[PDB]
C-alpha cells in the first residue's frame, strides 16, 4: 500500500526484533560485570521495552560499555519507530484533509 504505512509496519517489526536481540545481547554484555543487574532474559526484555519507549524507570540499566551501546541502539530504534508512526499519521491526515476541502 502507501509507502508511509509500509515504513511504519516495517519499523514495528524491526522494533520487535531489536527488543529481542537487545535483550539477548544485554545479558551477554552484562554478565561478567560485578554488580550488574541486567543479567536474566525476562527482566532484560522488560528493560528493553522501557528503554525503547524512553520511559527508563531506572529499576534496571546497563553498566558495561557493550550493554550501553546495545542500550543506545534500542533507544534509537524505538525513537525512530515511534517517530515513523507519527509521521505516517501526519501523511494520512494531510491527504484526507486536502480531500475534505
Amino acid at each position, epitope marked *: 500500500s502507501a509507502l508511509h504505512w509500509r515504513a511504519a509496519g516495517a519499523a514495528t517489526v524491526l522494533l520487535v526484533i531489536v527488543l529481542l536481540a537487545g535483550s*539477548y545481547l544485554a*545479558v*551477554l554484555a*552484562e*554478565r*561478567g*560485570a*560485578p*554488580g*550488574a*543487574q541486567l*543479567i*536474566t*532474559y*525476562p527482566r532484560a526484555l522488560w528493560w528493553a521495552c522501557e528503554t525503547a519507549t524512553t520511559v527508563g524507570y531506572x529499576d534496571l540499566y546497563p553498566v558495561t560499555l557493550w550493554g550501553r551501546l546495545v542500550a543506545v541502539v534500542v533507544m534509537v530504534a524505538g525513537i525512530t519507530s515511534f517517530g515513523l508512526v507519527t509521521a505516517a499519521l501526519a501523511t494520512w491526515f494531510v491527504g484526507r484533509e486536502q480531500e475534505r476541502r
Partner: antibody
Amino acid sequence: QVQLQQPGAELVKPGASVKLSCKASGYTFTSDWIHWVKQRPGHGLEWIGEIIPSYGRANYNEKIQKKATLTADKSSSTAFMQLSSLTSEDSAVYYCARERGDGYFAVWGAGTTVTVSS
Amino acid sequence: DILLTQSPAILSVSPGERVSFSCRASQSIGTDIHWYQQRTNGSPRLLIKYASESISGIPSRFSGSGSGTDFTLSINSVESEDIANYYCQQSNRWPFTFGSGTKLEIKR
C-alpha cells in the same frame, strides 16, 4: 531422562591438567547457560564460572584463583571445563548445572569426583 | 559481591514439627533467591524458585517466603526424607552466589 551427563571420576597428579565434560540432553535453547560448581568434602557449593554455548562466552568467579577455562561444542551438545596445574586444593566434586537464563539451576549433573594425588 | 548468610548452620526438630531455614542477603535482592536440597551423596535439587514459587515434583509441604534481604524456606511437618543440607542462591546481581548451608537434623 538424565539431562546432564558427567564422568564419575578423574585422577590427576599434582601439576597436571584435566578436562571435565558435561553432555546435555533434552530441550536446548539459545538462552541456556551451563555453570560449574565446586564442592569440597563436607563443605558447601562454590560457583566457578559459566558459559553460554550458543555464543561461546564464559565468565569466571573473580574471588578465587582461575584454574578453569570453559568451552562448549554445539554439534555434540557438550560443555567442557579445563582445570589446569592442580594441587590437593583442587580435589572435590565438580557439578555442571543448567540455567535457562532466568537465574536458577533447574538441573544438575551427578558430579565428577576429581582427586589430585601422586 | 552478595553475601548470603544461612544461620543457624544446623537445625534440630522433632518429627512432624514445623521447621524454618533462614537466609539473609548483605543487600536487597527483591525475590531473586532460590532454594536447593542436597541429601548425603546426592546432587543439589531445586525446591523453590524466586523465593516463593513452587516447583513440580516437590512435596507441597515445602514453602518459601520473604523479599528484600530476609528469606525463609519452610517445611510443614518435617519427615525423615527431609534430612539434608539446604542452600539458598541469589540471581539478582552478578555473580550468582550461594549461602553456606543449613543442615536439617531430626530428633527421634
